[PDB]
Design a protein around this ligand. Structure first.
Ligand SMILES: CCCCCCCCCCCCCCCCCC(=O)OC[C@H](COP(=O)([O-])OCC(O)COP(=O)([O-])OC[C@@H](COC(=O)CCCCCCCCCCCCCCCCC)OC(=O)CCCCCCCCCCCCCCCCC)OC(=O)CCCCCCCCCCCCCCCCC
Ligand SMILES: CCCCCCCCCCCCCCCCCC(=O)OC[C@H](COP(=O)([O-])OCC[N+](C)(C)C)OC(=O)CCCCCCCCCCCCCCCCC
Ligand SMILES: CCCCCCCCCCCCCCCCCC(=O)OC[C@H](COP(=O)([O-])OCC[N+](C)(C)C)OC(=O)CCCCCCCCCCCCCCCCC
Ligand SMILES: CCCCCCCCCCCCCCCCCC(=O)OC[C@H](COP(=O)([O-])OCC[N+](C)(C)C)OC(=O)CCCCCCCCCCCCCCCCC
Ligand SMILES: CCCCCCCCCCCCCCCCCC(=O)OC[C@H](COP(=O)([O-])OCC[N+](C)(C)C)OC(=O)CCCCCCCCCCCCCCCCC
Ligand SMILES: CCCCCCCCCCCCCCCCCC(=O)OC[C@H](COP(=O)([O-])OCC[N+](C)(C)C)OC(=O)CCCCCCCCCCCCCCCCC
Ligand SMILES: CCCCCCCCCCCCCCCCCC(=O)OC[C@H](COP(=O)([O-])OCC[N+](C)(C)C)OC(=O)CCCCCCCCCCCCCCCCC
Ligand SMILES: CCCCCCCCCCCCCCCCCC(=O)OC[C@H](COP(=O)(O)OCCN)OC(=O)CCCCCCCCCCCCCCCCC
Ligand SMILES: CCCCCCCCCCCCCCCCCC(=O)OC[C@H](COP(=O)(O)OCCN)OC(=O)CCCCCCCCCCCCCCCCC
Ligand SMILES: CCCCCCCCCCCC(=O)OC[C@H](COP(=O)(O)OCC[N+](C)(C)C)OC(=O)CCCCCCCCCCC
Ligand code: SF4
Ligand code: SF4
Ligand code: SF4
Lengths: 156, 102, 378, 176, 70, 315, 97
């Protein structure tokens, strides 16, 4: 068949692997981290999707920003994101990391982690239920499944 | 000839796996990254291991020494070394040599 | 002395001499959001959700401290049934807090299994929260004047079922830690605090009771209906991490003792003060009576006015002594709300409690204080 | 009333000392830990098979904000701005003016879903049950702008979920 | 349930079984259906070399009985 | 036919390591009331494949290293020696039949300590170097007891030949007369292999492979998981010897394999049940508790055959 | 023997889904091969089941359709494909389907 067909099946192989071994580095900053722990708890068992409970920043594929990002913590967050080997995705959890939430008008709060790092999935809630966070992780898996990295390379 | 072949195979395979693991990722051509006070307790444990290891080197041939006809002498010399190995441990123990609280 | 900046929401600048710690200097503010300055631009009702987010493991105990303080300035009194729903949900919330404290403390020193067993129970106690308020964590259920809504039918039956089987869950936790020699070695004679220094450093809660001080606000300065329930206050003898671990495990058992009595002694009646100028009227009578509609309109736009004055109200929160210093100027917005988080004083004693210990003992000491940085930083 | 947790003196008779000697040498109490973890291997796990199974909720659950109508299709909201005044996070922005027929209706009704703390005060303060929090908790997006709802999104949510909002209110309206 | 952990264990059991089965079969394939000769000491090596000469062929696993005598 | 033999050893070793990651995650999951991987493939059987592919197409992480050549030497040594410790193992016929196989395995495992040291050197992090020095001290300390305990068991077998441990146990398992040594041997393998409760290298809130991410990190992981099986295979031969029937060799492998697996499972069982030691508490467990007992039992087993006329044969 | 009816249940699951092909379809789509009573089916193709012998949380589940609103959902299923009327019964907000 056409060359695109072959290159488009290698893409599905790598995309299948990447979305089946998502290793998150959780930035547990505030109350939202308690719901993140409840996603690893027996009822939802994130590990059964291939999402290990906790991994070191150098081994991580996705960063979950779960809590209020303050002006003091902002530079430390961007340093962990710069040291993440690619491909790297960012998931914003809760209203604080989305747009500041209850502290949007504070003098010491960054109004959304999207001001510091790029974000792939926004999860609304205060806090999102462990089921809503799981729904947001499964939506990132579908986003990795629509990637066309090799198709773009072939037609360059 | 078989041991040399086996050793060559295990370290040849380990070499290929390493070099490909340092190159296969380097084809995505990602965007350019653009980014002790000496402790005397660690040395003491290292040395104490060496002196015990040498004492063990003198105990290794015990299985063969049990076959001799001078068993009375062999037994006395075997327990002498182990007792001297126990006295060495007992000396460091009582001199605070096994402690980690600075 | 090697200096290590163990940065990240806690940053410790430690001065090590080989293995021992010589100076521990916590740096905080990584979770400072200016809660106390926002509360001044909110009404008294609009500031209730802020207290759920101070110590986000003991949500409904935080709400209770604020409500008691505002009721004291108002000079009103919640009805008896509301008081029993607050003692009841104040002891469910103590199980949530001690499970997080004990399991996360054990998870940092290696023991990973008890976290997953006991966090299944936390999942069931979140359903009680979601069945009375609709939110799993930040219920905003306890409010000045009582509670928002009455318990739904069938809730007290489920709470009874959960209470029958919980003691067995604590026993499994104790079969893994209490007599384990590895666990005891990591806690016994670690972080010893003397009774006189605990008082002078500002400690409260188990930090006092672990060192022998016989003090518990639920028995010395009772609030709500804590004087109508019978329970024991466990006291340690050694003042180390192991004693405080036993104290937290025993308080979990005595919480089940209180929950058993609250279910049997729950009285009928209303669940919020029958004063429409403080608590809103029911929607049925807000749509038929002019007076009720007027009062609904004002309590949700302007709020109720609080007489001028200042108060400091403290409760025996699971972490320790939680209180607010609330100042009123005679309007519907607070003039000043100082929050006394128990972790602020406990984390300040880390340098003293960590003297003569090892680097790995600091993790155990931080976990025995039950530190949550939502309340430390506010 | 108080109790001591660790004020028991170990027995020093010969049998008791030998019991603690056998425990130290034969690792008796470390093998109980193995037993407890072996029991859990043969217990049924508490995991549910999401997204094919869901976690139980209640009619009071607070989820995605939504706007309702009367049975005749008329909007319930009459632009009283009580929800705008009690929102702790200042997430509701409302503008109103007389409609073409003289009714009191809104020209703007925006909720910043990234400022909302999902607290439920707006549905308590509404005197006509116009704004509610629905039972939906799966609306994660891929851009920050999709979480800024305007009147059209909120009215579409009400038309999308009315079948479930109506039955949830019916099951709880006698408590509120 | 717990028995769903067995499929993963089954693969490990088969994988660890192959190395011991392969060597046993290969040795019998290369030594005329007998166990590979063990020679730890020079006496046992001297006899093996002798059997290589007596074999006629240059192999020590070809045995000659009471038919090369007379 | 020998080159085929090696691949019949090397290749199934890596597959066993590949699916040991799956089993560890499920056994831990079911002990923690979870399910573990059960989505990627039926019952998680494709999960190892997904991780391996992902780790080998992930961006390299190597920062500046002082001795970059030493950066590549460390993984090669770790994986070459891990596979080399399998060649003398009787199952029931060794690939290479050594007369001093036991010394060979002792010697090879004492050289693996260089992988930890070279990795710490090349990391260009003075803090990581401290982490590597702590690991080396732990490893060498427990090599003392592995050697003495092993010496005490060979005084009942009569030689350093691994194949001779099958004959020594033809009537009875060696655990019965040497269960005190089995307990200390089993716990030293945990400490020698850097496994919980002795895995203080993973004291995240309290390692030396941090500088590695993806690719070479996977190779170190396989080297460690390959040693767990080998050590538990060594324990089965040493203390749980299996009967050998020359006319049915495959029966030995089945029984031998089951014992090796059950001992590999117990490693996962232990990690799920206990907290970890401090560094100074797992150094006192060796110098002040095990070593005093190991020396005493070494004296006992030197004189036990002599005073009972039970000295084993030399040949 | 209780040990034999365990195997019997493992077999009635193969027939419960309509043969090997149906058994493998649910195994690779839902990772669960249980058999329960059919409570209904919506206009989008989703089928809803029920088994009250299972512990709370697993006594209700849905097998999503293979095509909704013109989108192929054989592998790409989503939790938002449940219509509002069934959303209430699926989350145990009511006992009435
Ligand atoms: C190691 C020991 C041998 C393993 C045998 C395990 C076994 O037969 O389990 C029966 C049974 C398991 O039942 P249970 O765990 O007590 O409770 C589960 C429910 O009762 C009943 O649970 P259920 O109603 O959900 O039963 C559903 C099950 C029907 O039940 C079974 O399939 C169990 C049979 C597994 C074998 O059907 C399935 O789910 C099919 C999935 C099969 C997965 C693959 C399992 C085979 C592993 C081997 C892979 C190839 C090698 O074992 C026993 O209770 C007593 C015997 C245990 C020792 C085995 C002696 C033979
Ligand atoms: C089981 C054993 C597991 C170990 C073996 C793993 C092997 C898994 C298969 C590897 C398939 C090749 C995937 C390589 C990564 C491709 C990729 O990332 O695409 C982006 C890259 C980069 O695309 P790009 O050039 O357009 O990127 C431009 C954008 N910036 C500037 C940001 C980088 O695509 C390629 O370069 C094509 C790679 C060549 C195709 C190789 C095919 C050979 C397959 C056999 C090997
Ligand atoms: C790169 C490699 C990194 C180090 C790992 C390799 C270890 C090599 C050890 C092999 C020798 C051994 O100990 O077994 C003897 C073993 C011990 O067996 P044996 O003592 O039972 O006697 C064998 C013969 N019988 C039984 C009949 C008496 O000897 C042999 O099996 C074969 C004889 C030795 C001939 C092969 C040795 C050639 C030299 C190889 C070393 C080359 C330099 C390596 C540099 C390493 C750098 C660190
Ligand atoms: C005629 C007979 C004459 C000869 C008789 C010779 C034998 C006499 C009996 C000797 C007693 C046996 C000694 C056993 C070794 C005891 C080691 C010791 O000292 O412990 C103290 C040590 C330390 O004890 P401690 O921490 O309480 O402190 C001791 C010192 N003080 C009290 C002063 C501080 O404890 C441990 O070793 C625990 C290690 C952690 C273990 C965690 C994993 C447990 C796994 C359990 C499963 C094990 C399976 C083993 C089977 C393997 C099968 C292959
Ligand atoms: C506590 C934590 C650590 C515990 C480690 C637990 C794993 C160690 C292995 C314990 C189980 C013993 C193996 C049982 C399965 C062996 C299957 C088998 O080979 O055939 C039956 C084997 C027969 O294999 P066999 O070859 O050993 O029997 C002959 C024994 N000799 C060599 C002495 C003549 O017998 C058993 O293992 C029965 C075990 C009953 C006691 C337990
Ligand atoms: C128990 C373990 C068995 C593991 C091997 C079983 C064979 C694997 C076949 C995988 C095929 C995946 C598939 O297409 O769906 C299953 C299929 C599903 O059948 P189907 O009826 O849904 O076919 C439609 C499939 N699409 C839409 C993709 C074209 O069932 C089979 O197993 C057929 C083979
Ligand atoms: C023996 C040892 C190996 C173990 C083999 C036993 C397991 C085989 C199971 C059968 C696999 C067939 C696929 C499963 C059925 C299916 O189609 O489901 C689709 C599944 C599901 O797709 P999905 O991820 O979009 O769906 C997920 C969402 N749920 C769960 C709701 C469905 O996808 C796959 O299984 C794709 C498998 C890809 C296999 C890649 C192998 C690569 C070969 C190595 C690399 C070589 C280059 C270097
Ligand atoms: C997927 C799995 C598919 C299975 C096949 C994958 C492995 C490829 C096959 C192995 C390569 C074997 C090459 C070979 O023919 O080896 C013959 C040789 C025999 O040894 P000899 O002739 O006595 O002397 C050699 C001195 N260099 O022996 C040697 O050459 C020594 C071995 C050299 C390294 C071989 C490759 C190691 C990596 C695997
Ligand atoms: C041991 C059996 C034994 O001692 O009998 C019990 C006897 C009764 O005394 P009792 O009333 O129990 O209290 C101790 C009073 N001295 O107890 C006694 O009174 C005996 C005298 C007490 C002092 C005996 C101390 C002996 C312990 C030394 C260690 C023995 C084990 C050595 C081997 C270790 C390896 C296993
Ligand atoms: C020729 C190159 C060699 C590799 C061969 C291709 C393998 C990767 C394709 C599957 C990934 C995938 O997509 O898994 C899911 C697929 C279906 O895909 P879908 O969801 O409809 O994807 C839609 C299109 N997207 C992804 C672009 C959006 O499930 C299957 O039915 C696949 C199960 C059988 C796989 C058996 C592979 C055997 C090869 C082993 C040796 C290489
Ligand atoms: S979004 Fe809500 S739960 Fe999350 S950190 Fe902010 S206030 Fe806490
Ligand atoms: S639920 Fe609370 S935060 Fe959200 S719009 Fe209503 S009042 Fe505002
Ligand atoms: S409270 Fe109700 S009626 Fe008033 S503006 Fe808000 S939604 Fe409209």
């Amino acid at each position: 068949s056409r060359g695109e067909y072959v290159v488009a099946k290698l893409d599905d192989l790598i995309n299948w692997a990447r979305r089946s071994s998502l290793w998150p580095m959780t930035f547990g900053l505030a109350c939202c981290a308690v719901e993140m722990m409840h996603m690893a708890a027996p009822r939802y068992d994130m590990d059964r999707f291939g999402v290990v409970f906790r991994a070191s920043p150098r081994q991580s594929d996705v960063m979950i920003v779960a809590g209020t990002l303050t002006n003091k913590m902002a530079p430390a967050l961007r340093k962990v994101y710069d040291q993440m080997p690619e491909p790297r995705y960012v998931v914003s959890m809760g209203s604080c990391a989305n747009g500041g939430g209850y502290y949007h008008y504070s003098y010491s709060v960054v109004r959304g982690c999207d001001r510091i790092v790029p974000v792939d999935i926004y999860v609304p809630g205060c806090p999102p239920t462990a089921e809503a966070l799981l729904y947001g992780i499964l939506q990132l898996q579908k986003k990795i499944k629509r990637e066309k990295r090799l198709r773009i390379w072939y037609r360059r | 000839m078989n041991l040399m072949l086996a050793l060559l195979t295990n370290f040849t395979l380990a070499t290929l796996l390493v070099i490909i693991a340092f190159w296969l990722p380097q084809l995505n051509v990602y965007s350019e990254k653009t980014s002790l006070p000496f402790s005397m307790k660690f040395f003491l444990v290292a040395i104490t291991f060496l002196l015990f290891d040498l004492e063990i080197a003198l105990l290794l041939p015990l299985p063969w020494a049990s076959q001799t006809a001078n068993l009375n002498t062999m037994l006395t010399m075997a327990l002498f070394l182990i007792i001297l190995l126990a006295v060495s441990l007992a000396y460091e123990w009582t001199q605070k040599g096994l402690e980690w609280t600075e | 002395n090697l200096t290590l900046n163990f940065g990240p929401v806690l940053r410790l600048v430690m001065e090590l001499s080989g293995e021992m710690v010589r100076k521990c200097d916590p740096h905080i503010g990584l979770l400072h959001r200016g809660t106390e300055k926002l509360i001044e631009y909110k009404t008294y009702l609009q500031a209730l959700p802020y207290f759920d987010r101070l110590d986000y493991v003991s949500m409904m105990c935080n709400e209770q401290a604020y409500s008691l303080a505002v009721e004291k300035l108002l000079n009103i009194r919640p009805p008896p049934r509301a008081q029993w729903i607050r003692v009841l949900f104040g002891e469910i919330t103590r199980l949530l807090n001690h499970i997080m404290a004990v399991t996360t403390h054990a998870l940092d020193i290696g023991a990973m299994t008890p976290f997953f067993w006991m966090f299944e129970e936390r999942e069931k106690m979140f359903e009680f929260y979601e069945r009375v308020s609709g939110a799993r964590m930040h219920a905003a259920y306890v409010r000045p004047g009582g509670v928002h809504q009455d318990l739904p039918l069938g809730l007290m039956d489920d709470i009874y079922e959960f209470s029958k089987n919980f003691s067995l869950r604590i026993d499994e936790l104790e079969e893994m830690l209490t007599n384990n020699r590895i666990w005891r070695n990591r806690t016994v004679d670690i972080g010893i605090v003397t009774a006189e220094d605990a008082l002078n450093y500002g400690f409260s809660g188990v930090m006092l009771r672990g060192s022998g001080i016989q003090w518990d606000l639920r028995k010395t300065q009772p609030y709500d209906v804590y004087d109508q329930v019978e329970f024991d206050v466990p006291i340690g003898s050694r003042g180390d991490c192991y004693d405080r671990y036993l104290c937290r495990v025993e308080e979990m058992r005595q919480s089940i003792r209180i929950i058993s009595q609250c279910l049997n002694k729950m009285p009928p009646g209303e669940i919020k003060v029958d004063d429409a100028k403080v608590s809103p009227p029911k929607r049925a009578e807000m749509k038929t009576s002019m007076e009720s509609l007027i009062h609904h309109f004002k309590l949700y736009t302007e709020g109720y006015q609080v007489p001028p004055g200042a108060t400091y109200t403290a409760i025996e929160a699971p972490k320790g002594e939680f209180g607010v210093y609330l100042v009123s100027d005679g309007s519907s917005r607070p003039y000043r709300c100082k929050i006394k988080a128990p972790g602020f004083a406990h984390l300040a004693g880390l340098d003293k409690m960590s003297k003569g210990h090892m680097l790995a003992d600091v993790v155990a000491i931080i976990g025995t204080q039950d530190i949550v940085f939502g309340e430390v930083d506010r | 009333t108080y109790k001591y947790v660790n004020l028991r003196e170990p027995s020093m008779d010969m049998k008791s000392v030998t019991d603690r000697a056998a425990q130290t040498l034969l690792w008796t109490e470390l093998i109980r830990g193995l037993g407890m973890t072996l029991s859990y291997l043969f217990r049924e796990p508490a995991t549910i098979n999401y997204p094919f199974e869901k976690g139980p909720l209640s009619p009071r659950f607070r989820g995605e904000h939504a706007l309702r109508r009367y049975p005749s299709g008329e909007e319930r909201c009459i632009a009283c701005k009580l929800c705008e005044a009690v929102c702790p996070a200042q997430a509701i922005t409302i503008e109103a003016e007389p409609r073409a027929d003289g009714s009191r209706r809104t020209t703007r009704y925006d909720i910043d879903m990234t400022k909302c703390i999902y607290c439920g005060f707006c549905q308590e303060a509404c005197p006509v049950d116009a704004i509610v929090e629905g039972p939906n908790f799966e609306f994660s997006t891929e851009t920050h702008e999709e979480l800024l709802y305007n009147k059209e999104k909120l009215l579409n949510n009400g038309d999308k979920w009315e079948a479930e909002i109506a039955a949830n209110i019916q099951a709880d309206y006698l408590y509120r | 349930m717990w028995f769903e952990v067995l499929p993963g264990i089954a693969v490990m059991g088969v994988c660890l079984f192959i190395p011991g089965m392969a060597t046993a079969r290969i040795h019998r394939f290369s030594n005329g259906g007998k166990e590979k000769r063990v020679a730890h000491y020079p006496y046992q090596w001297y006899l093996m070399e002798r059997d290589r000469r007596v074999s006629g062929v240059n192999r020590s696993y070809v045995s000659k009985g009471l038919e090369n005598i007379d | 036919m020998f080159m085929i033999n090696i691949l019949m050893l090397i290749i199934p070793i890596l597959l066993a390591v590949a699916f040991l990651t799956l089993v560890e995650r499920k056994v831990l999951g079911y002990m923690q009331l979870r399910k573990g991987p059960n989505v990627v493939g039926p019952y998680g059987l494709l999960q190892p494949i997904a991780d391996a592919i992902k780790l080998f197409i992930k961006e390299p992480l190597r920062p500046a290293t002082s001795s970059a050549s030493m950066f590549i030497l460390a993984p090669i040594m770790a994986l070459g020696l891990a596979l080399t410790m399998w060649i003398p193992l009787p199952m029931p016929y060794p690939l290479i039949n050594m007369n001093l196989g036991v010394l060979f395995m002792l010697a090879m495992s004492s050289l693996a300590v260089y992988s930890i040291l070279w990795s710490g050197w090349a990391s260009n992090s003075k803090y990581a170097l401290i982490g590597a020095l702590r690991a080396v001290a732990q490893t060498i300390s427990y090599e003392v007891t592995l050697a003495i305990i092993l010496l005490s068991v060979l005084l009942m077998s009569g030689s350093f030949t691994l194949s001779t441990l099958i004959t020594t146990q033809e009537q009875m398992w060696l655990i019965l007369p040497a269960w005190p040594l089995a307990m200390m041997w089993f716990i030293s393998t945990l400490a020698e292999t850097n496994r919980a409760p002795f895995d203080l290298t993973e004291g995240e809130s309290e390692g030396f492979n941090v500088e590695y991410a993806a690719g070479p990190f996977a190779l170190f992981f396989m080297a460690e998981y390959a040693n767990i099986i080998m050590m538990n295979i060594f324990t089965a031969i040493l203390f749980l010897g299996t009967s050998h029937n020359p006319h049915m060799p495959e029966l030995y492998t089945i029984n031998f394999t089951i014992k090796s697996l059950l001992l590999t499972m117990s490693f996962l069982w232990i990690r799920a049940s206990y907290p970890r030691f401090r560094y100074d508490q797992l150094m006192h467990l060796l110098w002040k508790n095990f070593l005093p007992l190991t020396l005493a039992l070494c004296m006992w087993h030197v004189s036990l055959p002599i005073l009972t006329s039970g000295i084993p044969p030399q040949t | 023997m209780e040990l034999l009816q365990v195997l019997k249940r493992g077999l009635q699951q193969v027939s419960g889904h309509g043969g090997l092909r149906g058994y493998l379809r649910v195994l690779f789509r839902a990772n669960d091969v249980r058999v329960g009573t059919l409570v209904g089916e919506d206009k989008y193709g989703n089928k809803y089941y029920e088994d009250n012998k299972q512990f709370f949380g697993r006594h209700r589940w849905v097998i999503y359709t293979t095509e909704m609103n013109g989108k192929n959902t054989f592998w790409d299923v989503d939790g938002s494909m449940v219509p509002p009327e069934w959303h209430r019964w699926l989350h145990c907000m009511t006992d009435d389907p």
